[PDB]
Amino acid sequence: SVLKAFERFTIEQELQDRGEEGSIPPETLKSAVKVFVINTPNPTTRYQMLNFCLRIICSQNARASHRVGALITLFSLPSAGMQNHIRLADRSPEAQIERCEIDGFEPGTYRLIPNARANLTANEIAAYALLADDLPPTINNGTPYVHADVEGQPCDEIEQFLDRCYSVLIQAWVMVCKCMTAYDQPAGSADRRFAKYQQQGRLEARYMLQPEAQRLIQTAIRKSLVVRQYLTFELQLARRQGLLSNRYYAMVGDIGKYIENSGLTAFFLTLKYALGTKWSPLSLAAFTGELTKLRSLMMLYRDIGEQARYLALLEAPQIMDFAPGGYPLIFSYAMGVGTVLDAQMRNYTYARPFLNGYYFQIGVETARRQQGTVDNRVADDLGLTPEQRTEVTQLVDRLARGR
Amino acid sequence: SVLKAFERFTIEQELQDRGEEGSIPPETLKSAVKVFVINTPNPTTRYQMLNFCLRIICSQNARASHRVGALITLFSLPSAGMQNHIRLADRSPEAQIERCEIDGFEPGTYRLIPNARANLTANEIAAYALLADDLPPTINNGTPYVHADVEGQPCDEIEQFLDRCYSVLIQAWVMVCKCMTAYDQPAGSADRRFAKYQQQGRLEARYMLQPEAQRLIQTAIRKSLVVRQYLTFELQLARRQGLLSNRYYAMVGDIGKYIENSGLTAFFLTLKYALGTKWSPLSLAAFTGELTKLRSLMMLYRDIGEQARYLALLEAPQIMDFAPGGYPLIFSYAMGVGTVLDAQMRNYTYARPFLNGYYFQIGVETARRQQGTVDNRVADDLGLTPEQRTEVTQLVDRLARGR
RNA sequence: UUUUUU
RNA sequence: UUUUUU
RNA sequence: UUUUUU
């Protein structure tokens, strides 16, 4: 009937060439961003570079673009040829890299030596050195390193530098998974994930970061889109990798696994919990108007281009389509099943005003009732007899006590 | 029988070459609209330009065309090369852009310097400067900025300008979604949507707009078709974009998602709620005379050219075809189901005089009765037994209390 | 005719 | 809109 | 996250 037309209509509303678009945007005011490169593998140079960039991260009065450049440098230090990695950042718009080359710091504290190919102004060095010591008062020692001793210690061996740099890089990395989300919340979530890598040994607690620097890195990550684009490509490259790999990319991918779906949490939780745990209510003939939306949304996520696993991290209009408000009722039902099945999900926030309490209570009661609705054509694969089905349901009822 | 002829007839009534017409209209009295361009990326110049345009927005005695030009300039400031964007506005009729070029304001408050290529009259500068301070008495501080301090503060760095300009642009943008609709209503709807972006951080509350300026922008958007055409292309371009994008177009698309279907609300709500939630009544053999109309309307919306998602925003005769009055009875039924299922829809207005109360009450009773009409050939995909169907219906009945 | 919602 | 979890 | 066993 006309229902076929309605279904094709609803899908067509969701296929307005939104998924794949490999085109540039109209040009926009860029930001002159000054970035520095270390061609030689000198470990002392890169160590001083890491310390300098971390200083600039906490530079209180620094220009935003200065923080962007310091961040991009930081994320690019581990690379052998930093020229190539610096090049990749420019592949995105909003990138106007004033790529500079410094063979190394002067024997002064943070005084710099520009190289012949890429030079700068004397006022540049003066302002950068001024920016080198602007540190938050809440931070106790001048260094963000909590141990407050290693920053003084040098390293002339590539191995020691690699360990220190990897540790600091993962320090910064772990904060990404909470970028643009629950920033005002103190570090109640990352420490578990951080401590895991710590006792994995692939992290070092002897070189760790103070919480204030952590939150400053959080702020810088949110404020600067350039670093966001860079983190995207870094992670996209990491995923495509095989088993054998270097230390750094291996760690990056390992953390990125659950870094990815930082958003869509409502969507993923809803889809999983509802459309999987289909006991009683999913067939109601009143959820169709949202099931069509859900199917279209799945098609969207498949045909975005596999980058959708980073939609929240890359603030884009697609989230507005991936919105629970589009499908309030199935959302209510899924929240109902989740608040019963998991224990941690109880700690999750579901304060969307459009939520229908009626369907929410429907979900809760279905979860606490249908526990043990065995009978399926799938169930008969095991071959159990109906007497066995009754036995199973009764056994569930025995432990149903303790509510 | 003849019924085939009737159906083809009714569709043919709806296919009079109404959908796609890439042709110009007969020429009409245009409006000399004076617009200004800033080729250099100077941030102070563009900041002063933004302040000036916002002044002219609230210019009480200004010529309508003056407000049109100020608006178009405002919407075009973020672009790198504003020449190109100014060119696009002229692609529509009713566009007679007196495109002017000003390298920057004079050291006076708002005194202007025209450039050699595009000059004007001295009386032009005099009148524009006079128009610069005409401000509504209801506005407290001279500036529309509620904080009333940043307008004095300068900015010589492109980043600061970009942040300020984006914030102001979204300030203006969010009011578009209510253009030509519920204008007399105070800002009871936009604040939720605005505050969302605010705590998204992509907006800044430190630079926000007073409600009077908001309503003046509303008025200007309604009165001037040129800005409407410009907003259309801006949004049409935004939609076709891919994942990676600049800040500004990303925000524009993100808001435009639900900016789009600003009209057809009756149609979309009706089609969704009725033709989806088909429990009892949809098959009645008395809704056919409107179901044919509905199918034809769906074909119209598909074959308009995907721009139909902006039919209300682009006041066009097609709305008169997309009229509930064409299909009063299915409208009654859908309003009936909606007033039961959603809670917010209760706040919606459905005061069309042609509404049949009988079918409305039919819809209401069907919604409150058929809740839980499980049995479908689709329902059997889950494989539940009729005993399970009775269990589900009874369980719904248990929570049916609380009406 | 247009009036919520996300 | 975004808010756990691994 | 990883923690026996053969």
Author numbering:
A (entry chain A), B (entry chain A): 3 to 405
Can I see the authors' text?
Here, we isolated the authentic MuV nucleocapsids from stressed cells. After 1 h of 0.5 mM As(III) treatment, the isolated nucleocapsids were curved, similar to their intracellular morphology at early time points of stress but straightened on addition of the RNA-mimicking molecule heparin. We obtained two maps from subtomogram averaging on the heparin-straightened nucleocapsids isolated from cells after 1 h of 0.5 mM As(III) stress. The two maps exhibited distinctly different helical parameters: a 5.58 nm long-pitch structure constituting the majority class (77.7%) was resolved to 4.5 Å and a 4.70 nm short-pitch class (21.3%) was resolved to 6.3 Å. Interactions between subunits in consecutive turns of the nucleocapsid are mediated by the CTD-arm helix (a region succeeding the CTD), which inserts between the NTDs of two subunits in the upper turn. Within the same turn, domain swapping between the NTD arms (a region preceding the NTD) and CTD arms of consecutive subunits formed extensive contacts at the nucleocapsid lumen. In contrast, the loosely packed structure of the majority class exhibits higher exposure of the RNA on the nucleocapsid surface and higher likelihood for the unresolved C-terminal IDR of N protein to extend and interact with partner proteins, i.e., P and L, at the nucleocapsid surface.
N self-assembles into a helical capsid that accommodates the RNA genome to form a nucleocapsid, which protects the viral genome from host nucleases and serves as the template for viral replication. Both genome transcription and replication are carried out by the viral RNA-dependent RNA polymerase L and require the phosphoprotein P that bridges between the nucleocapsid and the polymerase. By obtaining atomic models for the authentic mumps virus nucleocapsid, we elucidate a concomitant conformational change that exposes the viral genome to its replication machinery. On the structural level, MuV nucleocapsids are templates for both viral transcription and replication.
